[PDB]
Amino acid sequence: KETAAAKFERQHMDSSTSAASSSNYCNQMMKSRNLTKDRCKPVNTFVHESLADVQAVCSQKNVACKNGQTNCYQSYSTMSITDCRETGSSKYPNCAYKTTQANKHIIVACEGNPYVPVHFDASV
C-alpha cells in the first residue's frame, strides 16, 4: 500500500505551480489528487515548493505536533502555500473548496530513513 511519505507528496506537494492561479485551484487539485474520491476531505494544504526544500524541513526546527508527537518540524523560511477548505455548499460527490493563497512557514511530521515528511500539521 501507499507509503506515508508518498501519501504526503500526493496530498500536499505541488511543485508544478508557483501559487494557486484561480479560485478553482482547490476544486481541481482536491479532485485530481483523489482527495474527494471517497468523501470530501474537509481541509488540505498544498505547498508550491520543490520536493527537496520541503523534505529538508525534517532537519529544521523541531516542535511538537498538534497531537503531541515530538517528530514535527517548522520550516525556517516561509513557503508559498494554498489553503483549501470546504465551502458551505460542498456536498459529496460535488466537493467544493475555498482557495486561499498564502506565504507561511510549514510544520510537518517526519519519519523513516531517509527521514522525510509523512504528515502536514500546520501553516504558521
From Swiss-Prot:
Any one of the GO BP annotations: defense response to Gram-positive bacterium
Cell compartment(s), UniProt: Secreted
Keyword annotations of the record: Disulfide bond, Endonuclease, Glycation, Glycoprotein, Hydrolase, Lyase, Nuclease, Secreted, Signal
Keyword 4Fe-4S: no
Domain of life: Eukaryota
Effect after changing H12A: Loss of activity
Keyword hit for Disulfide bond: yes
Tissue: Pancreas.
Enzyme class: lyase
Single annotated GO MF: nucleic acid binding
Reactions catalysed: an [RNA] containing cytidine + H2O = an [RNA]-3'-cytidine-3'-phosphate + a 5'-hydroxy-ribonucleotide-3'-[RNA]; an [RNA] containing uridine + H2O = an [RNA]-3'-uridine-3'-phosphate + a 5'-hydroxy-ribonucleotide-3'-[RNA]
EC number: 4.6.1.18
Main location: secreted
Active-site residue numbers: H12 (proton acceptor), H119 (proton donor)
Family, as annotated: Belongs to the pancreatic ribonuclease family.
Subunit structure: Interacts with and forms tight 1:1 complexes with RNH1. Dimerization of two such complexes may occur. Interaction with RNH1 inhibits this protein. Monomer.
Biological role stated in the UniProt entry: Endonuclease that catalyzes the cleavage of RNA on the 3' side of pyrimidine nucleotides. Acts on single-stranded and double-stranded RNA.
Descriptive protein name: Ribonuclease pancreatic
Organism: Bos taurus (Bovine)
Lineage: Eukaryota, Metazoa, Chordata, Craniata, Vertebrata
Included stretch of the parent chain: 27 to 150 of 150
